[PDB]
């Protein structure tokens, strides 16, 4: 489908369950990995990766050290640990690390994104969703500035507005989407341009 290798990000808080899960219900086995960092507590993180995969088409799964990033398949980072992105050779992976806690937060959505930008520069779409504080808002700008388009929830169906709305603030956001309409915006730049092989 696509020339090149393309993931999506994204970070979520308080609303973030409902969220995700309507976020990636449309997606098919043909979509590009998706890899998540939800603020929750460790053992959550591997119930929310099973509760969504009994509903969804795609894979999901709490991320483990070092598997490969595939396609068709959502990683959820564990709860308690950082989860980044990274590339050994040819292939993107996950990288989880017990470093200190981001934006008191750990996993960090800031490290999330810092790591997304660095690894996929363009090629990747991030995400930012309903939730309180500030984590995700200076990573979401590094990637906004390494030229990867940039999604924010919406102040109406957010639960709560926060994380959204700190991102917009620090000016890394492409657009700003109602959560009806994410899924459809992420998938549908991912793959504009040249991205699909013709």
């Given at each position: 489908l696509l ?14 369950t409902?969220?995700?899960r ?6 098919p086995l043909?979509?590009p ?12 993180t591997?119930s929310?990766?099973e509760?969504?995969?009994?509903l969804?088409?795609i ?8 598997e ?14 950082h989860?980044?992105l990274?590339?050994?050779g ?8 017990d470093?200190?806690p ?6 960090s ?9 660095k690894?996929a ?6 995400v ?5 504080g500030n984590?995700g ?15 924010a ?16 603030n ?5 657009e ?7 899924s ?15």
């Amino acid at each position: 489908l696509l020339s090149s290798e393309k993931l999506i990000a994204i970070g979520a808080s308080t609303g973030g369950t409902e969220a995700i899960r309507h976020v990636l219900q449309p997606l098919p086995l043909s979509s590009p990995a998706v890899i998540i960092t939800q603020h929750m507590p460790p053992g959550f993180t591997r119930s929310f990766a099973e509760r969504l995969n009994k509903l969804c088409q795609i894979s999901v799964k709490e991320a483990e050290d070092g598997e490969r990033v595939l396609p068709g398949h959502a990683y959820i980072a564990p709860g308690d640990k950082h989860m980044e992105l990274a590339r050994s050779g040819a292939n993107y992976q996950i990288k989880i690390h017990d470093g200190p806690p981001v934006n008191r937060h750990r996993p960090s959505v800031d490290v999330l994104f810092h790591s997304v930008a660095k690894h996929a520069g363009r090629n990747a779409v991030g995400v930012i969703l309903t939730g309180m504080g500030n984590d995700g808002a200076a990573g979401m700008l590094a990637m906004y500035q390494a030229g990867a388009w940039t999604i924010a929830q919406n102040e109406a169906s957010c639960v709560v507005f926060g994380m959204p709305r700190e991102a917009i603030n620090m000016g890394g956001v492409s657009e700003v989407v109602d959560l009806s309409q994410v899924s459809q915006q992420m998938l549908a730049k991912i793959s504009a341009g040249q991205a699909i092989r013709i």
